[PDB]
């Protein structure tokens, strides 16, 4: 077969810049195509052979490349173009596809708005509880959350849940699960979730003591 | 408008076999050439084969040559994988996808439908639990649902039947040490709208059949 | 800096059970799988079983069935390893790899990425620490001897990286293993600073300094 | 499942010589076979992947070819970095399976070891036991003769050898032989030498001392 050896694995930029993505054919081919897929949806047609904008693709797309090098160009970077880009050759038996360029929008930073969720007394019942903690529209993605239990350190009973950069405002969401049995749960009063940002000059930290509504 | 959709995604034991269907609508069903493409989450595109709805003349990839097979009901405009002795490393977001010759030679997969989940796993099928993530007394406040102890993916958060939208996130599903899949949705609203307009989630995990509506209340 | 982490090196008796632990750093863990690798003085290289890292189902060879259990615990990017009812046919090094599949799941089983190993000895005998005599000449050497199990650490002084030559140890008659280790001076006027041999056995929280006259 | 055979045994070449390894199987495996370099007390690290694919970082004087059952592997330009041993295995399907490998000496010219010899210490010998080292410094090649002689009598079986790993600088190996006898019989006899045979020496070289302190 014929491997697509994309360039680079991922990349960010700022709105209004001119992004290139290279790709790589094993053997000389004519033309490539390009697929865009978005989080959570299928790979969709960006550009054909050689260089035609499929349906509802704006002008600032655009495929070059001869011999084995091939390119594709966003002249002018807008939010909603984060997401995996695709070469793929067709001159071939089998069709195949480069692994992937992941593009990240980059805009201004932005602190996280943290939530603290206690466990609901309907999930006590079950036997378990779960303390969710939540940190909103923030930019860039790196976030450190820790939790505090009776000012103790917790480490390996807590889960993070990442969102894909936003469309419209390009930020992500965070959330963390903080997982205890009824009965470890029932031993401890204060619950803590310190947030730690790029754009938050000092942690933040959002707490609760059992059962204070 | 041309629209393929995808069925029969789901749990899978290893060794054990599935069958995909596409159905194909808004077009000559028997004018195009429809293919498989696969995609393990996290990872790229994968060419599995290709058929010939007007004659049912097949082409496969040489790796699924064997285990592989690919099948048409023209009269159903309906197209078919069939896998065989599936392993471990056969998880992937199964797609089928339209292809058009615009050209000699020149031709491109101009319509994708939206993929079905294959799940190759030795577990058994759980429904998941719905919680409530009360808001709780800045001009707003944050609410949501765990959706907790579920296998395999996917499940479908929707909030208030579809009618809220914006600023509704629904986390990615995390496999806790369980061996379980868990996530949670949650919506920012104004804090006014709080006592006055209520809130739904709307879950369901077609792999159980379980379709739960969770109204979530301050207290 | 993308790496596999392991464990300690484990001492363990018939019938015990073990579990060794693999964390990732530097990429997305749950985007490539993780295997399992046994190397044995001699034999070496069997591939025991893999994991797909996003459903957490394990792939056993059958030579590795039963007793032998794959897990993983993502929010700690951590791959773990679990022998049961030990076996002294277990001894060996297990190393945890990383799959470097970018483009999908067909082949995975070239291991880009490695971790460091860890080795396990079987058996009944307790932890012996050693005990080190000088190897004086009229070419400096010291004799760490009868210790169990490995390993052992020699170096000189801390910060003498001159023609040292810490050969490999030797399982004798006894059981114990025994090692010199040796090294080279200006072989003339060199007796005027001070040589210590810095000898650590972690298994036995013995740490000895001896100072060649 | 699929078997990986691998040859030679164990090869040596000089620095600047090309090498080959050759490693077949025993099915069918199109292009999915990878190549790996350890130097034991490290992991693996890859070469070659998908038969001809260099990995990350790994020289450009390493190629791979083949398909199907038979495999090579080359290394142009031989360095010292390039000491160790080699394995190849298939990715093609579970169960993966690996090459029973091969294992490479560089070349130096000739070398005469510098052998020394060491009594019993003082302390080992008030604890009841008395173990004689020789050291065999730093030559080439490997193959070495090491015999014990008390007082022109050869010891049997009471000898262990320690070979070190081949230096990733001048490449040249190490020696160590020890002969293990009792307070009690290190008591009783004088002469204790080392007799050391080697490619590099016309006469096999002895090293010898008087019981004790003198």
């Known amino acids: 077969?014929?491997?697509?050896?994309?360039?680079?694995?991922?990349?960010?930029?700022?709105?209004?810049?001119?992004?290139?993505?290279?790709?790589?054919?094993?053997?000389?081919?004519?033309?490539?195509?390009?697929?865009?897929?978005?989080?959570?949806?299928?790979?969709?047609?960006?550009?054909?052979?050689?260089?035609?904008?499929?349906?509802?693709?704006?002008?600032?797309?655009?495929?070059?490349?001869?011999?084995?090098?091939?390119?594709?160009?966003?002249?002018?970077?807008?939010?909603?173009?984060?997401?995996?880009?695709?070469?793929?050759?067709?001159?071939?038996?089998?069709?195949?596809?480069?692994?992937?360029?992941?593009?990240?929008?980059?805009?201004?930073?932005?602190?996280?708005?943290?939530?603290?969720?206690?466990?609901?007394?309907?999930?006590?019942?079950?036997?378990?509880?779960?303390?969710?903690?939540?940190?909103?529209?923030?930019?860039?993605?790196?976030?450190?959350?820790?939790?505090?239990?009776?000012?103790?350190?917790?480490?390996?009973?807590?889960?993070?849940?990442?969102?894909?950069?936003?469309?419209?405002?390009?930020?992500?969401?965070?959330?963390?699960?903080?997982?205890?049995?009824?009965?470890?749960?029932?031993?401890?009063?204060?619950?803590?979730?310190?947030?730690?940002?790029?754009?938050?000059?000092?942690?933040?930290?959002?707490?609760?003591?059992?059962?204070?509504? | 408008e041309v629209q393929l959709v995808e069925s029969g995604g789901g749990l899978v034991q290893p060794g054990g076999s599935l069958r995909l269907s596409c159905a194909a609508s808004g077009y000559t069903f028997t004018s195009y050439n429809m293919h498989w493409v696969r995609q393990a989450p996290g990872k790229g595109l994968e060419w599995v084969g290709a058929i010939y709805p007007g004659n049912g003349a097949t082409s496969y990839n040489q790796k699924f040559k064997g285990r592989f097979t690919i099948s048409v009901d023209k009269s159903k405009n309906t197209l078919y994988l069939q896998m065989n002795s599936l392993r471990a490393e056969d998880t992937a977001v199964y797609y089928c996808a339209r292809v058009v010759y615009y050209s000699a030679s020149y031709w491109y997969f101009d319509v994708w439908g939206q993929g079905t989940l294959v799940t190759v796993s030795s577990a058994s099928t759980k429904g998941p639990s719905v919680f409530p993530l009360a808001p709780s007394s800045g001009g707003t406040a944050a609410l949501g649902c765990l959706v907790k102890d579920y296998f395999p993916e996917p499940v479908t958060v929707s909030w208030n039947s579809g009618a809220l939208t914006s600023g509704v996130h629904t986390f990615p599903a995390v496999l806790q040490s369980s061996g379980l899949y868990s996530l949670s949705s949650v919506v920012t609203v104004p804090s006014s709208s709080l006592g006055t307009q209520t809130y739904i989630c709307n879950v369901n995990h077609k792999p159980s059949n379980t379709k739960v509506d969770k109204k979530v209340e301050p207290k | 800096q993308i790496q596999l982490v392991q464990s300690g090196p484990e001492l363990k008796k018939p019938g015990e059970t073990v579990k060794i632990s693999c964390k990732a750093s530097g990429y997305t863990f749950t985007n490539f799988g993780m295997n399992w690798v046994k190397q044995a003085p001699g034999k070496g290289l069997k591939w025991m079983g893999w994991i797909n890292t996003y459903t957490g189902e394990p792939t056993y060879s059958d030579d590795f069935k039963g007793r032998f259990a794959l897990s993983l615990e993502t929010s700690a990017s951590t791959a773990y390893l679990q022998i049961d009812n030990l076996k002294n046919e277990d001894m060996g090094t297990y190393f945890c790899?990383?799959?470097?599949?970018?483009?999908?799941?067909?082949?995975?089983?070239?291991?880009?990425?490695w971790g460091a190993g860890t080795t396990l000895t079987v058996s009944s005998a307790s932890t012996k620490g050693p005990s080190v005599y000088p190897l004086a000449p009229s070419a400096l050497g010291c004799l760490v001897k009868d210790y169990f199990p490995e390993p052992v650490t020699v170096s000189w002084n801390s910060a003498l990286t001159s023609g040292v030559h810490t050969f490999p140890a030797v399982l004798q008659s006894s059981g114990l293993y025994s090692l010199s280790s040796v090294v080279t001076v200006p072989s003339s006027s060199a007796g005027t600073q001070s040589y210590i041999c810095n000898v650590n056995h972690a298994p036995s929280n013995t740490k000895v300094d001896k100072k060649v006259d | 499942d699929i078997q990986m055979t691998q040859s030679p045994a164990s090869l040596s070449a000089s620095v600047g010589e090309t090498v080959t390894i050759t490693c077949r199987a025993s099915e069918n495996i199109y292009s999915y076979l990878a190549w790996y370099q350890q130097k034991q007390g490290k992991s693996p690290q890859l070469l070659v992947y998908?038969?001809?694919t260099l990995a990350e970082g790994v020289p450009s004087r390493f190629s791979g070819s083949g398909s199907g059952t038979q495999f090579s592997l080359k290394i142009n330009n031989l360095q010292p970095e390039d000491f160790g041993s080699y394995y190849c295995?298939?990715?093609?399907?579970?169960?993966?399976?690996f090459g029973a490998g091969t294992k490479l000496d560089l070349k130096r010219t000739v070398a005469a070891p510098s052998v020394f010899i060491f009594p019993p210490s003082d302390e080992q010998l008030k604890s009841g036991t008395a173990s004689v080292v020789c050291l065999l410094n730093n030559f080439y090649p490997r193959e070495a003769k090491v015999q014990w002689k008390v007082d022109n009598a050869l010891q049997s079986g009471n000898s262990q050898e320690s070979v070190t790993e081949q230096d990733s600088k001048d490449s040249t190996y190490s020696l160590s032989s020890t002969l293990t006898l009792s307070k009690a019989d290190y008591e009783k006899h004088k002469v204790y030498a080392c007799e050391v045979t080697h490619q590099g020496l016309s006469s096999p070289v002895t090293k010898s001392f008087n019981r004790g302190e003198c």
């Open positions: 295995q298939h990715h093609y399907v579970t169960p993966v399976t």
């Open positions: 790899a990383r799959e470097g599949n970018l483009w999908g799941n067909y082949a995975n089983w070239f291991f880009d990425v």
């Open positions: 998908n038969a001809k």
